[PDB]
Design a protein around this ligand. Structure first.
Ligand SMILES: [Cu+2]
Length: 128
């Protein structure tokens, strides 16, 4: 839809998009994450995590240290605007968030917090 995006994270440690623009008419925005491939969550799990660009590093840093069972995310992290679960191949997860949490002119980034993945698995999101 206009107010959602389907995104894939694959066994090549890559998202199939690196830029998302959100229409100002959207009250909510939904991201549907899926995982083509064959590798399980413990070696190639992906999540979709959204924060301001400013916060990306801190979110990734705390997440990796939080470990696998916590989906590589710090619990109750207020820097995170939206997050999916960490998924393995063949699994899928969605998240919806309020577009009011986005700001005009500000850059947000989405990324995977599985250790190292953010080297390639990142993109920008901003209001259209
Ligand atoms: Cu990943």
């Amino acid at each position: 839809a206009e107010c959602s995006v389907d995104i894939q994270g694959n066994d090549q440690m890559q998202f199939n998009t690196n830029a998302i623009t959100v229409d100002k008419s959207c009250k909510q925005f939904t991201v549907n994450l899926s995982h083509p491939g064959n590798l399980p969550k413990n070696v190639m799990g992906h999540n979709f995590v959204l924060s301001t660009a400013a916060d990306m590093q801190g979110v990734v840093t705390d997440g990796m240290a939080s470990g696998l069972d916590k989906d590589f995310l710090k619990p109750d992290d207020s820097r995170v605007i939206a997050q999916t679960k960490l998924i393995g191949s063949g699994e899928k997860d969605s998240v919806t968030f309020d577009v009011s949490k986005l700001k005009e002119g500000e850059q947000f980034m989405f990324f995977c917090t599985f250790p190292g993945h953010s080297a390639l698995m990142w993109g920008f999101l901003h209001l259209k």
